[PDB]
Symmetry: C4
């Protein structure tokens, strides 16, 4: 019978914790280096979302200087987007990426971006397993046989495989886990992100193709978990939004400091439309460099606790335990009133 | 032993998500057409609840114009109910339904409604598996052999089967999931709605009889899930209550705009009574046509994500994953303050 | 290995719902009659807690008049307790019970209560499986071979069995589920109440001995569930506290009307003590008769939905489904603002 | 496949309850005596955290007088720490412990503490399975063959074993359950505490080595559970913070009385640092002696309910049931407004 076609149970970040192990690794000796694509290395496993409230040249420069790579968003003219890529390239040999989406008629944007020296092109869609997206990847790969191309987003083994066979240099994973996302609520479609990363990685591992975990990262411990689940690096929006280097001005509202943060599927980013994201504000965070130091500090401390000398060790060898709701509540601060916010644990 | 007679675990909407798949379907090319009954087609898979704060001729007209069908409520005289059915029929060949409940002595209401040209009669009860309800269905089917009859509500395979054998043209499913319902709390009786739809559909599928999923639909993603669970269309109360076309005037209260919305089992709708619903208010929503566009937009986007070309594909082929509480929390917007409500994600 | 000695998973009320079935039963034709003990019948399956903020003669009279039985509390002199039992007996042949606890030196209280015509003696302890309690039961049974004796509380098969072999006429079940109870938090000891009732009943059924489900009943649906789990009737404190007939005066506080309600293990009821209950206030509820009508209305409607003609049918034949947290949230009223509290669903 | 490397499910305090059993034990006849180490007995199973807002000589004296042992913290000079150990020793032959952490260069602190008469040395780390910690234990054990040494923290069987083989006299268990801890959130690493205690004890039991359960104890029932899980005693911070005897002055804030309580991994305790704890305030609690009486009262009442004559009986024979979220909610006080806080159940 099995009238209800339930393929399996799926987990996200708050369903699991990493198990501590024998370790000779110290936090400050952990090696954070990793891969974005088969041919592009990173010194830290962080990439910035291709969103108009997160990544232009300014943030892409600060991030590349810390060892990551920024993806310049496409909500600007072809000329401005190429100028922004070029600005990153002439700021000290830094690497940069750029998003172009998946619609037809992006050829001229793609050509401008390759000419401006873009290191990696992101063909990104809310549905990477769409035949349109797969065909744009094939055409771009035939047109530019040596361009590094990231394609996404998928949330399944099958999708990771279709992207790899279409020619991607990395698979980006995540359908609906984003802070600003309403896709799962408005469509009913999604896969909890830890299960999505692991399913994608089980395929991509076979071809040596890295998986980028995109969306849903809120605390530095979610980075650790995303990597242990199979990701080679993570993509973040909300963790970098609100930084000084992110686009837009600081807004003061009811004693607090904010920057705008919105989904690229929100009515405002898209300009009757049916949106799959919201328009919001995110607490001002100060300089990207300090945020990065705190988040990588957490990852470093995990690598010490797990005995993971390198990111590959965390990604292929660390183990999880599955926890309940009570388990998650124990993991947070509890039964004490906080008198000073820690820089790596800001709730409100 | 098994002293505790637990038949199985049961799931509702927030326990599951739909898995994305290979798709050539685009949202605006998805085919939304479906069946209400074996012989009555709909252009969209939405029917309105037979409630006195949701459906009279006005809403039934607007909905039929969008491709759905409205069920005129029975809290009015036989004459007014027939006049309302007739008003829908002479508003451009629109289809209309009407509720009559299940008590004896409804014969003359039934005759008036058939004469006024009603397309589908709803014999609706809070307990469709009641022998009284089954006998009213049999008598109505012998009296009107070609009248389309919907019978409900049930929440089990056995109940769906008893309704089919009594002569129904469609089975309506749902015991207790409604927004305004206190049945499960006051009686202890109910079945989580995704499991209820799937159990009913496993039976009804064998006879080609559609299942209508009634109650508990809050976001457009719940529509997708209800169909993937086996429903051919959904019935909604609260999603249409508060629209301009729903009965009753707009109430202004503490800066906000409302319309009355109440269970038909509430003390007010029934006039010592023991109620199984409450009397409430629901946010003013504006015109039904825009609400419908947003909800069908979500369903369309699901069909694109799932590669479901038609509603039948979603209903018989899409797959689910089971999620935890943490999974559901990730699916909503999280860790960002919303500055503008999206029209398809209004919380408060 | 199994270092963690976990005997099994256990459930309470909000973990389960009752499945609707074929029914010829109508709510107002359901038979509510049941057994308190092997030899004492009740017209409704409700008994009142032996608490000093719930049951003296006044409430015990009103309840017996509705078909239940009240247990007079022991926080008064032997003489006052016998006078209260006698007052119920001379108010029209009504049945009455009285609590005496389990400490040595209760012989003279017991003799006074039997002489005042008590129908049923409650030897009640927070730990019915205590050897002291079992020996007081044996001695009382040898002293009064025809006195109906209820012993409790237990939460296991083994405990139910030890009480039966000690000579009880009914087993009372519940360790820690009470509204006003902190036992499980302060000791770490308890069994979720639906599992506790079913385990006890699996034993008691073999001897024809009824089980009384004591504590944790909040809504009328919990009564249905407690019986379907194996109870012959339920004992309630908080549902009857705050009624006009319960002991104590109405307190007005911040616009609302209250009566005191406290655990018998609270510091105030016991007068360095280590309490296992709290002192509180409970909303004023009006007359017991109307409360009873609402709660039995819910039970009646369950019996209609489940096709349970008698309480025995509900107790031995109805089936459950296990639900998630999302299931429970769907069961309550949701996504609507309540404008008028229903008499059987008062939250605040 | 099993791409997601999930070793097993893990539980903490709120996931389980203890099952009541046949008992001849009365609360006030229960024997609370236990072991801290193989060679050091305690009269009650409570030790105080080595934190600068919890334990100096003053609290260590009051606790030892009640039958426990206090661990003097190391955020002071070697001389002050030895003077504090000495003060406890000359306050009536009381036992005392002292923390030294795990970094190299602690030799001279260790020598000063042994000379000042410390009974037990705590070599404590946030990662007891670190090779650095294991080597400091070996060196300290070769240097002081008869010094009782506690090593920690671990959360696994493997870790308990590595500590035992390094020479510890007791294993301290807990990675991340502390009130003031953000390790699990900032690193992603941790094990729910009931599972952590049981896994560690399965190893330590084989060598007769006690396990100390450290962190996450909020109510006296958590003590019972920690012992039944395999601990010989518990270590607490927040339960003793805010007592009169704990370090620091009472702070009055918004009508309420507090003392500072902070993680030893917090930015303030450590003085760019990446912290693993927060700085907070905890309600003023009054004298340690009364707190201890309430907490041991709860444990005593558990031993009565479980028929556990001694702590060893609770630790090796008591059984658990696994509960849901609804189970935990039933265990707390519910559906009543508390008018007087009980001394053993203070929420706010
Ligand atoms: C492309 O950026 C995304 C991504 C990566 C994801 C989602 C999403 O909604 C958007 C915005 C949707 C946009 C800009 C409309 C164009 C399109 O539909 O491709 C999602 O739910 O999971 C992943
Ligand atoms: C009939 O409308 C419903 C339906 C469809 C359902 C329930 C319900 O309470 C009412 C109102 C109950 C009324 C009007 C009283 C008459 C009766 O009892 O039939 C429910 O809980 O699941 C389904
Ligand atoms: C006896 O009334 C109870 C019962 C029935 C239960 C509990 C309880 O705390 C009390 C009050 C405890 C009292 C009055 C102290 C005397 C004693 O201990 O027997 C409980 O937790 O489950 C069941
Ligand atoms: C040592 O005290 C602890 C313990 C016992 C634990 C944790 C922790 O963060 C600290 C403070 C961390 C400090 C003082 C920094 C030095 C170090 O790292 O050892 C934890 O998460 O589980 C157990
Ligand atoms: O409007 C949107 N709806 C849904 N997902 C979006 C939208 N805009 C961007 N995203 C995705 O959300 C991610 C950011 O998630 P975050 O880091 O949790 O804030 C982006 O990298 C995209 O994958
Ligand atoms: O008083 C009531 N109690 C319980 N269910 C009701 C009541 N009135 C109507 N219903 C059901 O609730 C459904 C509406 O649910 P909603 O769409 O979640 O607001 C209706 O279609 C009926 O099935
Ligand atoms: O102080 C107490 N602590 C724990 N349980 C108590 C206490 N006083 C009474 N009880 C139990 O709690 C029951 C009432 O539970 P209630 O109906 O949920 O309010 C009583 O019948 C007793 O079994
Ligand atoms: O900063 C910190 N971060 C994490 N754990 C800490 C920190 N400081 C102390 N601890 C641990 O937390 C325990 C106290 O937990 P508590 O009793 O739940 O308040 C201590 O005994 C240590 O094991
Ligand atoms: K914690
Ligand atoms: K989301
Ligand atoms: K409901
Ligand atoms: K309780």
């Amino acid at each position: 019978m099995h009238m209800l076609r339930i393929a399996k149970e799926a987990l996200t970040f708050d369903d699991v914790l990493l198990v501590p192990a024998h370790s000779t690794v110290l936090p400050n000796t952990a090696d954070l280096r990793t891969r974005l694509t088969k041919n592009i290395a990173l010194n830290i496993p962080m990439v910035s979302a291709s969103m108009d409230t997160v990544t232009e040249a300014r943030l892409a420069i600060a991030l590349a200087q810390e060892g990551g790579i920024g993806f310049i968003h496409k909500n600007m003219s072809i000329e401005q987007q190429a100028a922004q890529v070029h600005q990153v390239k002439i700021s000290g040999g830094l690497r940069v990426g750029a998003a172009v989406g998946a619609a037809p008629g992006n050829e001229e944007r793609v050509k401008a971006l390759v000419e401006a020296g873009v290191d990696v092109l992101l063909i990104d869609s809310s549905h990477g397993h769409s035949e349109g997206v797969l065909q744009r990847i094939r055409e771009t790969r035939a047109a530019y046989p040596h361009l590094e191309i990231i394609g996404g987003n998928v949330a399944t083994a099958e999708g990771a495989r279709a992207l790899i066979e279409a020619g991607v240099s990395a698979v980006k994973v995540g359908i609906g886990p984003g802070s600003i996302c309403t896709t799962r609520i408005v469509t009913g479609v999604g896969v909890p992100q830890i299960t999505a990363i692991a399913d994608a990685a089980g395929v991509a591992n076979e071809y040596g193709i890295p998986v980028i975990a995109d969306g849903g990262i809120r605390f530095s411990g979610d980075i650790s978990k995303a990597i242990a689940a199979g990701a080679s690096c993570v993509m973040v929006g909300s963790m970098f939004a609100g930084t000084e280097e992110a686009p837009g001005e600081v807004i003061l509202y009811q004693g607090r400091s904010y920057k705008a943060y919105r989904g690229m599927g929100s009515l405002g980013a898209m300009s009757k439309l049916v949106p799959e994201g919201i328009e919001g504000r995110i607490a001002y965070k100060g300089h990207l460099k300090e945020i990065i130091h705190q988040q990588m500090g957490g990852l470093r401390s995990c690598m010490g606790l797990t005995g993971s000398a390198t990111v590959e060790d965390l990604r292929t060898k660390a183990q999880f335990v599955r926890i309940s709701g009570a388990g998650m509540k124990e993991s947070h601060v509890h039964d004490v009133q906080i008198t000073k916010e820690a820089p790596n644990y800001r709730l409100g």
